[PDB]
Amino acid sequence: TKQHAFTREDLLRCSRGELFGPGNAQLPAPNMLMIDRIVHISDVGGKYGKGELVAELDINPDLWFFACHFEGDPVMPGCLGLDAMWQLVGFYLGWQGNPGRGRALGSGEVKFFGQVLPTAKKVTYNIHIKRTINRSLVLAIADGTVSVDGREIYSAEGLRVGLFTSTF
Amino acid sequence: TKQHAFTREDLLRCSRGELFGPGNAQLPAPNMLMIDRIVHISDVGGKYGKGELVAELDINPDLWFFACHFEGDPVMPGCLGLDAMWQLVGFYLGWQGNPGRGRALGSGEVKFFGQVLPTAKKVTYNIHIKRTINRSLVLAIADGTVSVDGREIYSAEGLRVGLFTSTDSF
Numbered sequence: 001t002k003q004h005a006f007t008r009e010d011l012l013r014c015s016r017g018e019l020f021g022p023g024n025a026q027l028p029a030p031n032m033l034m035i036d037r038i039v040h041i042s043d044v045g046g047k048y049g050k051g052e053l054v055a056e057l058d059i060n061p062d063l064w065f066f067a068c069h070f071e072g073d074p075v076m077p078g079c080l081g082l083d084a085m086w087q088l089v090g091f092y093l094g095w096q097g098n099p100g101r102g103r104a105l106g107s108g109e110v111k112f113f114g115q116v117l118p119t120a121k122k123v124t125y126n127i128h129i130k131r132t133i134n135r136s137l138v139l140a141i142a143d144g145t146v147s148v149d150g151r152e153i154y155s156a157e158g159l160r161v162g163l164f165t166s167t168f
Numbered sequence: 169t170k171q172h173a174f175t176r177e178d179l180l181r182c183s184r185g186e187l188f189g190p191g192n193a194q195l196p197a198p199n200m201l202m203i204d205r206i207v208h209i210s211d212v213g214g215k216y217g218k219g220e221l222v223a224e225l226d227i228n229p230d231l232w233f234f235a236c237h238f239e240g241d242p243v244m245p246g247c248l249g250l251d252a253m254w255q256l257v258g259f260y261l262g263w264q265g266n267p268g269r270g271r272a273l274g275s276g277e278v279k280f281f282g283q284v285l286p287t288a289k290k291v292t293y294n295i296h297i298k299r300t301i302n303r304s305l306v307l308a309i310a311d312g313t314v315s316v317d318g319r320e321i322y323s324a325e326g327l328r329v330g331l332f333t334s335t336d337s338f
């Protein structure tokens with residue numbers, strides 16, 4: 001029943017609410033959307049055996065955030081790479097067929113120890129689903145890392161995203 | 169260490185690199201800047217006795233992020249409120265007179281347990297500096313909370329921001 005890779009246009013469709021349906025998970029649209037394509041997604045395998053996503057974002061100097069962050073010293077904001085990981089975990093929940101709107105619930109340790117310059121080519125996200133809880137509220141817990149051109153730069157442990165039937 | 173409150177235009181000046189000077193801390197400019205004003209900043213008091221910042225962001229429905237996040241369900245992204253806390257801690261380091269460019273280093277527990285709708289009036293940030301380290305790299309550790317119209321919605325423990333001179337590597 002399941003598609004395992006998505007193009008930018010599949011994601012934009014999701015952003016309109018047309019991939020998972022109305023009242024279900026949506027990715028944000030530009031300029032908040034931090035994913036160009038989902039290269040792989042399954043509910044088996046991964047670090048913990050409970051699924052995995054691999055996603056990419058193409059970089060070029062003209063990306064909007066580089067001009068305002070910072071003047072004379074462009075660099076992609078860490079919060080945006082962080083948010084991509086939440087975006088992806090949300091996407092995963094909706095992709096599993098669960099109903100409701102997505103909201104990030106937070107995380108454990110987050111680390112930034114590198115940066116994305118405008119001279120980079122591609123950012124890649126790797127997410128490992130640790131647990132899904134299907135009680136009175138439905139939620140996913142995952143670890144994620146963000147890499148730029150092969151090199152690992154951010155990490156986030158215990159990312160939490162939850163789904164809300166009635167919008168918190 | 170002298171001025172204890174800043175206006176939006178002080179912050180835009182900072183964003184140009186004209187408040188703390190070249191090679192020192194800068195806030196980002198719009199649309200990444202998540203602060204309209206810093207209502208209070210000192211290096212004494214706060215939760216831990218090592219300083220405090222209180223800052224505000226005015227909300228209105230036409231803020232850019234509401235239109236793309238999400239279509240049919242606008243809500244301020246949590247990462248942006250989070251980033252405001254890092255922006256503020258960075259600002260604090262430069263305001264103390266330390267040299268170097270700011271980079272968020274991460275945090276411990278982050279919690280989102282409410283939201284900012286476009287019908288809100290004002291987001292307020294409260295940051296408590298826990299520790300500053302002035303070793304070979306200079307950095308600040310702080311807890312912060314984000315509130316909307318009086319109500320507490322996000323919290324971040326162990327926010328870390330560090331300063332990087334022209335010799336310091338990333």
Ligand SMILES: CCCCCSc1ncn[nH]1
Nearest residue numbers: 077078112254258271272
């Ligand atoms: C203090 C302003 C927060 C923006 C910096 S985001 C960042 N990228 C790599 N490290 N940190």
Ligand SMILES: CCCCCSc1ncn[nH]1
Nearest residue numbers: 086090102103104246280
């Ligand atoms: C499902 C997409 C993940 C982004 C939700 S961002 C958020 N807004 C208020 N709390 N958290």
